[PDB]
Write a protein that binds this ligand. Structure first.
Ligand SMILES: O=P(O)(O)OCCNS(=O)(=O)c1ccc(OC(F)(F)F)cc1
Ligand SMILES: O=P(O)(O)OCCNS(=O)(=O)c1ccc(OC(F)(F)F)cc1
Ligand SMILES: C=C(/N=C/c1c(COP(=O)(O)O)cnc(C)c1O)C(=O)O
Ligand SMILES: C=C(/N=C/c1c(COP(=O)(O)O)cnc(C)c1O)C(=O)O
Ligand SMILES: [Cs+]
Ligand SMILES: [Cs+]
Ligand SMILES: [Cs+]
Ligand SMILES: [Cs+]
Lengths: 395, 268, 395, 268
């Protein structure tokens, strides 16, 4: 029994060991209570404004759309404290943890941005934070490992499986199933068992709410499309939520295409996987013929996950949102282009969304279109990875 | 069939508890796994709990994670597990056989077809580790249609509504969880909770088998004296496999010694 | 002849080779013109808001003042696009460069934050940017070198002298004296020849203006003191300017004490140097008995400069502002403390200001005081340096 | 004294321009520097421009930056430069001697005391490189009080107000800058600007010496034919020092050859 619907059509649910059900129910009740609590809402709003820096800017690109009929704005979540959108919902969940009398936090991280967000919120709010991170990601997103540790978080490398986000997810959930009495699992994406996809969306929806107010102010109308990259789905659902009922507004989610869909080395289950049960949810996943979970791949650690949040699977199924993929090389070109022509260094995850928007423009350069890209994070964490690639490439 | 029912009636007549080892099918290979299983039975196992190797076993600690990995390294697939199961049943007509499954392996090419395969090879129960009672409907329905017992979990902090649902929906045996966390021999299960054991009996639940962290004869005796119908041990058995990979004869001797001692303890 | 006063009491002036005087006069006239130009002001305001992210938050510390009568707010210039206050005045100067028909930019950088700011503004506004950086700083602030280059800026290591900020300054000025016909020198601090100390102050003064509005809103009164670190003086004068006429408001500038004033390895000329002429200005400087310019030292590259802007020398002389020093070890403790107790990773430069505020609190813990620290930048650029130190220290 | 006035009157009588080498005092050491300077004079230098080593010479390119560094490596201080100057004047009573200074070295322990020291050792002019006419008052006042000529710079894009101020405030000679930028033999000065040369004469300015990038006899001839009273060469002379550090005799022979050729060119 739940207070809220755990499903989005066929997708979602609470596919966890029985031991964890009371924790999920407790979380859901605490969330419902907090959502109607003016003191909670005021505390959360104050942290977002005065600590995290909201509202974040909406920047019109000045150069990259030259010579086309595309007007492109970037929602600047890269300016949020911590350097990505992850910080928004971490502040809300940290307050819920406190509300439930918990004093410890478990989190998984891939890009290290959710881990940084979790560490910073725990330092601020007096929680003991431990973060699981795949060993491959400890290497390719190393600046975030140093940031997490300086903030007093324990960072636990995960060597099992693919040593990437799914494996950090597995360890976090294993840990929680033994420590839930004292630890809150601060899941960092719009995926996993209910109530997480719902809470994460509700604690990210200020992204789209602000976008709407800002585009109305600057353009006097809604966007033709809003475009966001999709790992587990939090930044995309945060951007999408407030536009769902605005039927004219296109919702475009961008999965990582890795080395190319045809190679099997990607992270695009929504369009190229099939429905399975894993990580507490029924959702599209990359799986073998026998139902073993496949290892994903992407140049970007934040997108390197073989599943996707169930609300995205649902929005796709009914045709309300469209999902596409962008390869590693397309993402890199978009990264370079934004650095050199707009003076913004984007996260490689966010560069997938940008790459798609650039494609929309370039493919149809006389199509009148007003687009918003969710610039989910800054690329400081990626600069060594990108440098090394461009040098090996002979640039 | 009625293999659990017959087993428990026999154990009761002998005023005895069950000892039920867990292993991963095909760990460290198909041939050795079959020999391991025959050794467990010859040494006194009353029933078996058998793992199908799964890529991401979220209820298992490192010991059994590593069993799954050894099976995959040997190229074990669920199809090969079903071939093994057929061979085990062919040798051992009455021993109850329960599968430890993760949901995706059951859901993969159709829930109904999965349980139909279980019936054909003569499996008696299926425990789907990541499907709580709240999500269990199509699983328990398919199990019962194919004469398979769906196994549900009674955790230490089970409330009354949960006790009633587990008693109603489950068959074969009730899983009495020793503790929170994941499988592991080093993390010792708590003493069996008398109140849960007694409430399950009051609600006519399938007999309880205590599991998680049971790695010593003393814990088996404690479970039975608390009123449980028996105990399950996985990681302790698997460590004997892991320790003796280069010594297959010593492996079977140590498995036999351990299983015999754990079974002796079930008579307390 | 000038339109504006080149001096602050005895300090300042235009001590450059005669060749550069027309460039300085041209810059001054362009600045005066732009200051009364509503279109210029609107363009600058739009970039600050919609591109850089202004206004920046004013954060009340929640934990670090516990048990004392100090209320401490941090002005969050670490949240500005680029990661430091440097971005504010770069946007204004870049617009002036364009206004004067120049298409190239020269800048010096120490911490690499002014260089990053210069590179980003040049990418946005279509200028060719070259940045001089001391070779020691190329090493200890390396993340900023990668950021500058990804944005298309040329980064020129300077091996001469101390291979730090003063040496990058020297090369930038040498370059400008030959390239001024086509290049604007985008000096990054409130120092050098007139009109730079004036322009830099006027293009940074939004820091203190916003601070004042924010403290009035939250506290209903002015701060007892505002505290800022002082390299060349831009973030400090940006914070101070709007409070100069509020006689009750203390203005505290923090110079780097390095390994300790007594060792001679510091960057604190305002309090420990003597008046000299160098880098186009008459100002306090670290100099030998004979008048050779001494090499400075600080753990922080942004503060590692043997002089100071002339308006600070002036404010000190009349007692309107007080100047103090903070050592490397004091700065490091403040860095660690903010990371672990407020979940903010400060620049090591900004950590000098914070360290002083923490001292004010700790020395007199029952003194009622409302303080603002200018948190001039984020410490991403410092994380490898700080890690290496704390590890060598056995932590 | 009147050493520049006497020199230019003599050069005019002979219908000849001046050749004025620059070196850094004490490069590569005090003794060798003194020999270098005697060699410059014996080879035909009409006047000297002499650098006092300074830590941050912002109007100088790498060649002269490196001269300053060699002098510092030899432990040269301004005090030792004044001791050298006294020795040079003692040997050579009439040759005009001009110092190239940076402001801090003049300002350091008092502007007046600096120019008083210059007078005592018999220096004739001081050029302070980073003090424009706009900041020059206390410098030119102190210079004139101590019978030292303050030298000012006429850049290529000098306007009329500047031409008038340089003509009025300067004495000894007017510096006619060849080009923008910093000192350097590789960056060749432009042809002397006839209009500036003629305007300076119209305003009764001290005679003009063209400098920056003059490294060949042809450029010396071009400066004189354009109406300048002579030319200064620094980096070209200094490179001969830098090239021959391990060969002090070859150094002086090459300095002599070069200076002789540059002086011959001043008669064109
Ligand atoms: O002895 P240990 O600690 O290794 O425990 C072995 C248990 N093996 S098992 O098949 O019964 C078993 C039973 C239930 C499990 O998860 C669930 F409770 F969530 F369903 C996992 C394994
Ligand atoms: O031959 P080069 O190119 O080395 O030039 C040598 C010139 N040496 S100097 O003393 O006359 C000399 C004169 C003026 C200088 O700077 C100023 F113009 F700003 F004042 C610097 C050096
Ligand atoms: C998984 C991680 N990051 C994901 C991420 C993503 C993708 O995750 P969502 O689909 O949940 O937004 C997008 N943008 C940025 C900057 C990100 O850091 C992490 O930091 O743990
Ligand atoms: C000199 C540099 N930085 C100085 C600096 C300073 C000191 O410079 P000002 O005194 O000009 O603010 C303070 N804070 C931060 C974050 C800084 O980066 C530079 O980035 O080039
Ligand atoms: Cs456009
Ligand atoms: Cs994904
Ligand atoms: Cs306080
Ligand atoms: Cs300084």
């Amino acid at each position: 029994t739940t207070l809220l619907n755990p499903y989005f059509g066929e997708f979602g649910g609470m596919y966890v060991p029985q031991i964890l059900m009371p924790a999920l129910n407790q979380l859901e009740e605490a969330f419902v209570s907090a959502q109607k609590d003016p003191e909670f809402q005021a505390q959360f709003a104050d942290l977002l404004k005065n600590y995290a820096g909201r509202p974040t800017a909406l920047t019109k690109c000045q150069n990259i759309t030259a010579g086309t009929r595309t007007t492109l704005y970037l929602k600047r979540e890269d300016l949020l404290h911590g350097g990505a959108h992850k910080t928004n919902q971490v502040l809300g969940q940290a307050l819920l943890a406190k509300r439930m009398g918990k004093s410890e936090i478990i989190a998984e991280t891939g890009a290290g941005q959710h881990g940084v967000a979790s560490a910073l919120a725990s330092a601020l709010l007096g929680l003991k934070c431990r973060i699981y991170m795949g060993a491959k990601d400890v290497e390719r997103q190393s600046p975030n490992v140093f940031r997490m540790r300086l903030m007093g978080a324990e960072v636990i490398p995960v060597h099992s499986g693919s040593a990437t986000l799914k494996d950090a997810c597995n360890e976090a959930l294993r840990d929680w199933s033994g420590s839930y009495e004292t630890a809150h699992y601060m899941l960092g994406t719009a995926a996993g068992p209910h109530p997480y996809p719902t809470i994460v969306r509700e604690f990210q929806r200020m992204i789209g709410e602000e976008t709407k107010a800002q585009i109305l102010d600057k353009e006097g109308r809604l966007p033709d499309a809003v475009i966001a990259c999709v790992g587990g789905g939090s930044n995309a659902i945060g951007m999408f939520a407030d536009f769902i009922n605005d039927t004219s507004v296109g919702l475009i989610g961008v999965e990582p295409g890795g080395h190319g869909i045809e190679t099997g080395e990607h992270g695009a289950p929504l369009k190229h996987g099939r429905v399975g049960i894993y990580f507490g949810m029924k959702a599209p996943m990359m799986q073998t013929a026998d139902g073993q979970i496949e290892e994903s791949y992407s140049i970007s650690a934040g997108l390197d996950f073989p599943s996707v949040g169930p609300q995205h699977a649902y929005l796709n199924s009914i045709g309300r949102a469209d999902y596409v993929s962008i390869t590693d090389d397309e993402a890199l070109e978009a990264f370079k282009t934004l650095c050199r022509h707009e003076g913004i260094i984007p996260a490689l995850e966010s560069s997938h969304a940008l790459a798609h928007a650039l494609k929309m423009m370039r493919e149809q350069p006389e199509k009148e279109q007003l687009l918003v890209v969710n610039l989910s994070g800054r690329g400081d964490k990626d600069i060594f990875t990108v440098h090394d690639i461009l040098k090996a490439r002979g640039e | 069939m009625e293999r659990y029912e017959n087993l428990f009636a026999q154990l009761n007549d002998r005023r005895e508890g069950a000892f039920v080892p867990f292993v991963t099918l095909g760990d460290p290979g198909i041939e050795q796994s079959l020999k391991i299983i025959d050794t467990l039975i010859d040494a006194g196992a009353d029933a078996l709990e058998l793992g199908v190797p799964f890529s991401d076993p979220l209820a298992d600690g490192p010991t059994i994670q590593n069993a799954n990995l050894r099976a995959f390294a040997a190229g074990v697939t669920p199809a090969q597990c079903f071939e093994m199961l057929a061979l085990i049943r062919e040798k051992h007509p009455t021993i109850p056989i329960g599968l430890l499954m993760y949901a995706n392996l059951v859901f993969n090419n159709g829930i109904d077809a999965f349980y139909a395969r279980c019936e054909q090879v003569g499996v008696d129960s299926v425990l789907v580790a990541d499907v709580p009672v709240e999500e269990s409907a199509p699983f328990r329905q398919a199990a019962l249609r194919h004469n398979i017992a769906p196994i549900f979990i009674c955790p230490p902090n089970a409330d009354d509504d949960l006790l009633r649902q587990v008693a109603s929906y489950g068959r074969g045996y009730t899983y009495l969880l020793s503790r929170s966390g994941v499988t592991g021999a080093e993390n010792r299960g708590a003493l069996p909770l008398h109140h849960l054991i007694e409430k399950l009996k009051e609600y006519h639940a399938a007999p309880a088998l205590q599991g998680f962290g049971i790695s010593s004869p003393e814990q088996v005796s404690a479970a039975v004296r608390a009123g449980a119908a028996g105990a399950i041990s996985g990681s302790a058995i698997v460590k004997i496999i892991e320790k003796n990979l280069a010594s297959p004869k010593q492996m079977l001797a140590e498995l036999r010694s351990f299983v015999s001692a754990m079974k002796a303890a079930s008579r307390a």
